[PDB]
Design a protein around this ligand. Structure first.
Ligand SMILES: Nc1ncnc2c1ncn2[C@@H]1O[C@H](COP(=O)(O)O)[C@@H](O)[C@H]1O
Ligand SMILES: [Cl-]
Length: 227
């Protein structure tokens, strides 16, 4: 089996690039992401739209309530070995994402050391202002009102109803920013979808900055995968 590993920081187009290989090959893409295993935050965690998937399969390591906590790395790693191992007949698989903790587990693990052919791609953080431009665009996409999927702000207001979800959303990118933006201006979280467009731009900007901060960590704590 051939494993096509695509990894790198947030907003580096890794997802689209995975999808493209998946349409050409017919191979599933397995998301190397813990946060995306909570579908109640599908949009804000970076899950592609069903329309964007272009009929390819994208596999998550678990499907879980946000209030059960984000899947831990060692559990997600064990889950990942499983999704690969039972598909071992298949010609290939695409592993794509940016979970720092799960990539590091992959790098300590004997499983990946033998038994596979490999195509490895690391996307790198480029210049910051190019990064920010792409970050903002992405945030605006997640913010867009659609009749087929909740916005990030909608996902956030829905959960904010459940007190146990509150501590957990405050440790997640986009959400932490959005929560802090609301307190900063004395708005209720429920009220975040209804802000004037002037306040909307301020928030796109702040979330982008929180993405840059995260992409910078990804660059430090990412394992250097051998090519
Ligand atoms: N898809 C994602 N969306 C938002 N935040 C994320 C995502 N993946 C990781 N994070 C953040 O990065 C921190 C470390 O997770 P990880 O990169 O999976 O080890 C998490 O606690 C989240 O705050
Ligand atoms: Cl990406």
């Amino acid at each position: 089996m051939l494993l096509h590993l695509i990894y790198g920081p947030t907003c580096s187009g890794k997802t689209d690039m995975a999808i493209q290989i998946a349409q050409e090959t017919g191979w599933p893409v397995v998301a190397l992401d813990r946060v995306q295993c909570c579908p109640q935050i599908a949009t804000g965690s970076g899950r592609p739209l069903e329309s964007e998937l272009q009929s390819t399969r994208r596999i998550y390591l678990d499907s879980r309530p946000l209030t059960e906590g984000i899947l831990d790395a060692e559990s997600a790693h064990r889950r990942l070995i499983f999704e690969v191992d039972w598909r071992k007949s298949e010609e290939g698989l695409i592993l794509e994402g940016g979970s720092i903790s799960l990539l590091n587990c992959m790098a300590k693990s004997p499983f990946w050391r033998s038994g596979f052919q490999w195509h490895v791609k690391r996307l790198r953080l480029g210049d910051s202002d190019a990064f920010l431009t792409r970050a903002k665009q992405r945030v605006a996409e997640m913010f867009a009102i659609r009749e087929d999927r909740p916005s990030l702000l909608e996902e956030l207001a829905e959960l904010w109803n459940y007190p146990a979800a509150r501590p957990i959303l405050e440790d997640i990118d986009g959400y932490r920013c959005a929560i802090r933006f609301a307190r900063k201006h004395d708005l209720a979280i429920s009220q975040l979808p209804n802000i004037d467009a002037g306040r909307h731009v301020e928030l796109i900007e702040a979330i982008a900055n929180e993405y840059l901060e995260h992409a910078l960590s990804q660059e430090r704590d990412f394992p250097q995968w051998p090519e």
